[PDB]
Design a protein around this ligand. Structure first.
Ligand SMILES: [Mg+2]
Ligand SMILES: [Mg+2]
Ligand SMILES: [Mg+2]
Ligand SMILES: [Mg+2]
Ligand SMILES: [Mg+2]
Ligand SMILES: [Mg+2]
Lengths: 110, 48, 143, 92, 52, 95, 49, 354
RNA sequence: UCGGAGUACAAAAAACCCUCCGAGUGAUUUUAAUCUAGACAAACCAGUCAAAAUAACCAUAACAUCACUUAUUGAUCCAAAAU
């Protein structure tokens, strides 16, 4: 026949944790084919572009201004051609950290 | 005797390492310059 | 016993500067789609207007902690040509001074590749270094 | 520590230097072990620690080598509080 | 063109091997790799030809 | 599986299990990952690690293996020098 | 277990204690057919002993 | 199903029709700037700032200050214009500029700074370190009078206390030299407080050194309420912050209530709330100067607790929370062997009946 | 058999002897380590990410890169190799 091999299963690309959820460090917050959500505060980026939590806490999604890295040719070109008032916005994921960093305890009284 | 032979071999070849990798770095840096000099001496002979 | 001897097991340290000085605090890992890296306790920020040179020391809160500007009368009146390389060096020295006085010895500086090549900034960094302020913050502990 | 005669005087004094942190206001040197559920193993850990301390203190060849990793902050903040300390006028 | 799977050996005297896809019409391969036993970056030179 | 043997009338074990699995005494079975010696040059070091693991089997597999295996293999073993003696009891399990 | 056996007068510490004595107090069970090579002594009750 | 934007959408302003006639920033840098200005405005959508704690956001500041110095705008402006004309006039200066050789007389800049915008910088450093948050709770004052504090480390050695700086307790074993500029109809009160490091009471602090009814710049002439007590952080806890406060008072104030014994080595006796103490005398006292320093445990402090306070010495650790493990499952599936160790109690064999 | 787009309009999944493009690899040097919290995905088998900690290197130096990058692949046993 003419048409062939269109058959492949879904990749289950989606957003795993949602706004307001609790997370433990290392949880995958999302997984994506192209950048849809960008990693924000305390969110690590994997090499497959999936976002995971670096800290125990609460997930939050946010719109924010996008200022690409100057080592990236494409993005700087896209930014450079904008009309003088315009600002790129994107969607970010953060984890607002929950536990305090650590505590001070009384070891021994000398 | 096996352990001492292994350790001997390892010390022996670890003493030879900087000379080897330096020699090979010079070898490759000489190869690159040989090829580039070829390409320039060809570029100038085609230009003329 | 002694009425002084009472302690309580858990010590509350109310001081916000503390865990940073100890290096134990949390930097902000993340972003890394965007730029610059927001991972730091303190960051040196150098803004160059066509007129004035302004060097700020920032906290990730965005709050300016200690700064030196050329609009400032103290610096403006002693020297000449606010936009010069001379001015950058100057501001750097002033800022180093005020930083030591503020108790902050470490900060991160993330310049642009072409700002790193420029003279004014090379000498800003030199002034900052001889001033005793190290760029490149200490690592985190159990990061 | 001062009343312990089974250790020499130079060593008895050098111990009270390095270990002054774990010494007590009553003059006592306190060692502690934790790990095993068996206190034979804890006692043994303590005794081995003590043996080691008396070992390194009785060695005059101990150079007390310090790492730069956690001490970089210490050297630099030291030097940088020394830039300010350098103001010279007599006082009091 | 075909590529080839070569077995590369350490010059650190430690028997250690790793295989690499290498161009058939190219020269004998030599690299700077990591040897785990010596725990160093060392010179590896291709000992053998494994798969074609 | 032979449920009743011909000579003894007992129940036989399937030896093909006993070569690839390991039964801790708790009832957990332990196995190698599949394809861990296969085509190593072609794989990531991360994947290679994931392959070099010893992993646990889900309940279904476990029950299947238990059926395929006689009583002798479920006995409490004390071996001298045994790596796995550490792992044969279960601890802190609230169910 | 050794202490608990001595306390209850199963094995007596007075005469020497070897494998047969442990077996006769039923403090321990050996099955050579399973390649048991004998008893080993472990430290669980060390402090209490 | 669409919803309707609430207020303005960000780029809705510029015209898409005729893009060629619109000016662009062809600079990465201009863009970066514009973006950082956009990142500071109060948007109507969920933002980073909102969740990450701008720390009360907008706050109306109760201000207990000294009134700002009154100076003529136009006069000052003219004088500065002239000074800069003069300085720009010289050829020597220009030579110093082109050839990259020039220096700024840092002492004079420190002088002008102390005179001009210094108070504000010191203020925001104090806000940064949360002096105002633990002292007056809501209140911000601008340090109009400069406060110069120093310690004698030896005969020739002088260790200054600037705002925020680090000092060792060895240096601070003695009462410091204090200097500020006032003529005398004046009366002042100087205060040294340890903002944290109180052992029992999280919300309370220690008064180390409290002096009162201070004529002019004369330090020793004032009657000391609380005798100088050297800094004593505890070994474990890092970096306590000590605060020198200066109050301009009008009427002579006498307090038998706040007066402490002459040796006063009891901790219950020095327990202090700067807020309360200020509430009391609030009518006469107006806080003027400020200088504060960071201080961490060092050797000498051990002598304090034993020798002075007649105490054992408390030592602390930094204790991190135990790592989080999921509920243990009967049949951990496809999990590494070392799984069974995460739920392990302690590493030791235990033979139950055996 | 594997992948991309539509079918399948906005979390996931989703069929057809349905509509369309592809893969069974090149090229390159930056030759891309050990160990381990927590997860994704999932009938099973297989697949995916990944903090901290070690060791390598500037002497606080761990994502190979490009071609739409996604796919360029194959279990046991058994054979050859000797590590
Ligand atoms: Mg499809
Ligand atoms: Mg399908
Ligand atoms: Mg038995
Ligand atoms: Mg004006
Ligand atoms: Mg799932
Ligand atoms: Mg790491």
């Amino acid at each position: 026949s003419k048409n062939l091999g269109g058959k492949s299963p879904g990749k289950r690309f989606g957003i795993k944790k949602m706004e307001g959820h609790y997370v433990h460090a290392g949880n995958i917050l999302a997984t994506q084919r192209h950048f849809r959500w960008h990693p924000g505060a305390h969110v690590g980026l994997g090499k497959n572009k999936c976002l995971y939590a670096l800290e125990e806490g609460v997930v939050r999604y946010t719109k924010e201004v996008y200022v690409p890295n100057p080592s990236n040719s494409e993005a700087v070109d896209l930014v450079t051609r904008l009309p003088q008032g315009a600002v790129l916005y994107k969607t970010f994921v953060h984890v607002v950290p929950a536990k305090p960093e650590g505590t001070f305890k009384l070891v021994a009284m000398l | 005797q096996k352990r001492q032979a292994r350790e001997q071999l390892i010390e022996e070849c670890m003493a030879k390492m900087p000379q080897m990798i330096e020699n090979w770095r010079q070898q490759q840096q000489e190869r690159r310059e040989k090829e580039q000099a070829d390409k320039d001496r060809r570029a100038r002979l085609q230009a003329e | 016993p002694v009425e002084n001897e009472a302690v309580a097991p858990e010590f509350t340290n109310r001081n916000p500067r503390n865990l940073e000085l100890l290096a134990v605090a949390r930097k902000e890992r993340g972003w890394g789609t965007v730029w610059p890296s927001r991972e730091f306790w303190h960051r040196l920020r150098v803004i160059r207007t066509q007129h004035h040179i302004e060097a700020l020391v920032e906290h990730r809160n965005g709050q300016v902690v200690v700064s030196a500007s050329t609009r400032e009368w103290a610096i403006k009146k002693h020297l000449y040509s606010t936009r010069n390389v001379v001015a950058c060096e100057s501001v750097g020295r002033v800022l180093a001074e005020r930083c030591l006085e503020a108790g902050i010895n470490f900060m991160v500086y993330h310049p642009t590749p072409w700002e790193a090549a420029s003279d004014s900034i090379k000498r800003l960094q030199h002034a900052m270094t001889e001033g005793g302020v190290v760029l490149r913050e200490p690592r985190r502990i159990y990061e | 520590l001062a009343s312990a005669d089974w250790i020499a005087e130079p060593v008895r004094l050098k111990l009270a230097v390095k270990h002054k942190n774990r010494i007590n206001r009553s003059g006592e040197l306190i060692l502690t072990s934790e790990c095993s559920r068996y206190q034979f193993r804890n006692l043994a850990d303590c005794l081995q620690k003590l043996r080691d301390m008396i070992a390194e203190a009785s060695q005059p060849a101990k150079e007390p080598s310090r790492e730069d990793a956690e001490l970089r902050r210490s050297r630099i903040e030291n030097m940088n509080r020394e830039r300010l300390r350098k103001k010279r006028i007599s006082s009091a | 063109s075909k590529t080839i799977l070569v077995k590369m050996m350490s010059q650190a005297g430690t028997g250690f091997s790793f295989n690499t896809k290498r161009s058939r019409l190219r020269e004998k391969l030599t690299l700077l790799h990591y040897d785990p036993v010596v725990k160093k970056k060392v010179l590896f030179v291709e000992q053998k030809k494994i798969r074609s | 599986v032979t449920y009743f043997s011909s000579r003894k009338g007992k129940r036989k074990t399937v030896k093909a299990v006993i070569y690839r699995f390991l039964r801790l005494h708790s009832g957990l079975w332990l196995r190698r990952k599949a394809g861990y010696k296969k085509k190593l040059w072609k794989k990531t070091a991360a994947r290679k690690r994931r392959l070099r693991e010893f992993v646990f089997c889900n309940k279904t597999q476990s029950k299947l293996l238990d059926k395929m295996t006689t009583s002798f293999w479920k006995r409490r073993n004390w071996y001298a020098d045994d790596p796995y003696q550490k792992y044969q009891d279960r601890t802190n399990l609230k169910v | 277990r050794l202490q608990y056996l001595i306390d209850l007068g199963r094995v007596d510490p007075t005469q020497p204690i070897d494998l047969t004595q442990l077996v006769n107090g039923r403090g321990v069970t050996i099955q050579p057919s399973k390649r048991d090579y004998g008893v080993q002594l472990v430290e669980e009750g060390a402090d209490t002993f | 199903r669409r919803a309707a934007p609430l207020g303005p959408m960000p780029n809705e302003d510029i015209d898409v029709s005729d893009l060629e006639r619109l000016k662009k920033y062809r600079s990465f840098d201009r863009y970066r700037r514009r973006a950082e200005q956009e990142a500071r405005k109060p948007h109507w959508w969920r933002t980073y700032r909102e969740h990450f704690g701008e720390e009360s956001g907008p706050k109306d500041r109760v201000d207990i200050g000294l009134p700002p110095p009154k100076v003529s705008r136009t006069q000052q402006l003219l004088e500065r214009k002239q000074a800069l004309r003069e300085l720009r006039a010289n050829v020597e200066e220009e030579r110093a500029a082109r050839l990259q050789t020039a220096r700024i007389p840092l002492e004079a800049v420190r002088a002008e700074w102390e005179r001009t915008c210094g108070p504000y910088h010191k203020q925001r450093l104090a806000e940064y370190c949360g002096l105002y948050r633990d002292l007056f709770h809501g209140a911000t004052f601008v340090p109009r009078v400069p406060l110069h504090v120093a310690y004698a480390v030896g005969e020739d050695d002088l260790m200054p206390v600037y705002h925020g700086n680090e000092v060792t307790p060895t240096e601070a074993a003695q009462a410091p030299e204090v200097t500020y500029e006032a003529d005398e109809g004046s009366l002042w009160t100087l205060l040294l407080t340890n903002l944290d490091g109180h052992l029992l009471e999280p919300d309370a602090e220690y008064v180390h050194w409290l002096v009162t009814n201070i004529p002019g710049n004369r330090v020793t002439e004032g009657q000391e309420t609380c005798p100088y007590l050297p800094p004593f952080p505890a070994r474990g806890s890092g970096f306590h912050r000590f605060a020198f406060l200066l109050f301009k008072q009008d009427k002579r104030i006498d307090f038998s209530g706040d007066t402490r014994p002459s040796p006063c080595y009891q901790l219950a006796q020095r327990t202090f709330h700067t807020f309360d103490f200020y509430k009391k005398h609030q009518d006469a006292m107006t806080p003027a100067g400020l200088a504060f320093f960071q201080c961490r445990w060092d050797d000498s402090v051990t002598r304090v607790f034993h020798q002075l306070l007649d105490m054992r010495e408390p030592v602390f650790e930094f204790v991190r929370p135990p790592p989080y493990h999921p509920k243990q499952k009967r049949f951990p599936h496809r999990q590494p062997l070392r799984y069974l160790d995460r739920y392990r109690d302690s590493h030791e064999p235990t033979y139950g009946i055996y």
